[PDB]
């Protein structure tokens, strides 16, 4: 009665902290907002976080909930 | 059970969109203002057969 599975979705972090990225570059693929969009980062319809400017990726923990945000520090 | 329909431009261009409809629940004709790229204006589009 078992024997089924789905294709692996290649989620996860594509660009880690301090990496130089071009605008448009995908930083994380995820299901929901496990990471949140900080400065110069957009959030796509499938919760993909992507760079809206050229610069370096920065992960940070901010807010009252203590949420993982991703920003781009512009070069 | 949802059936494919055309939405046909009222501008007389022959431009159409396609969508689906549940004709059992919603037998009345779908009418929407949509962009007609031929005349390059938003005009009324009205349901027709696919």
């Amino acid at each position: 009665r078992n024997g089924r599975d789905s294709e692996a979705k290649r989620l996860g972090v594509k660009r880690f902290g301090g990496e130089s990225v071009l605008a448009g570059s995908i930083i994380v693929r995820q299901r929901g907002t496990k990471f949140h969009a900080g400065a110069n980062v957009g959030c796509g319809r499938d919760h993909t976080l992507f760079a809206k400017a050229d610069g370096k990726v920065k992960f940070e923990v901010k807010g009252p909930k203590n949420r993982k945000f991703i920003s781009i520090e512009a070069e | 059970i949802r059936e494919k329909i055309k939405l046909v431009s009222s501008a007389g261009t022959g431009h159409f969109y396609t969508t689906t409809k549940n004709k059992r629940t919603k037998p009345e004709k779908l009418e929407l203002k949509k962009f007609d790229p031929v005349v390059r204006q938003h005009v009324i589009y009205k349901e027709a057969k696919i």
Binding site: - | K4, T18, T19, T20
Partner: protein, 64 residues
């Protein structure tokens, strides 16, 4: 004797200036209502044959 062109390949590929091949994208013949306009728009322009496939296309089109 002369090599014969694979005539089905000649109807689907055209050789470009630097010797690549252009083709029409798959998935824009039918079952179009369910496809997003964005997806269909991106399938309209012709594309280049990929590196992996060039060997197969060249074999089929010796007089390209």
């Amino acid at each position: 004797p002369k090599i014969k062109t694979v005539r089905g390949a000649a109807k689907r590929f055209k050789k470009t200036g630097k010797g690549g091949f252009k083709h029409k994208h798959a998935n824009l013949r039918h079952i179009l209502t369910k496809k997003a306009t964005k997806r269909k728009r991106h399938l309209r322009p012709k594309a280049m044959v990929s590196k992996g496939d060039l060997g197969l296309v060249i074999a089929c089109l010796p007089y390209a």
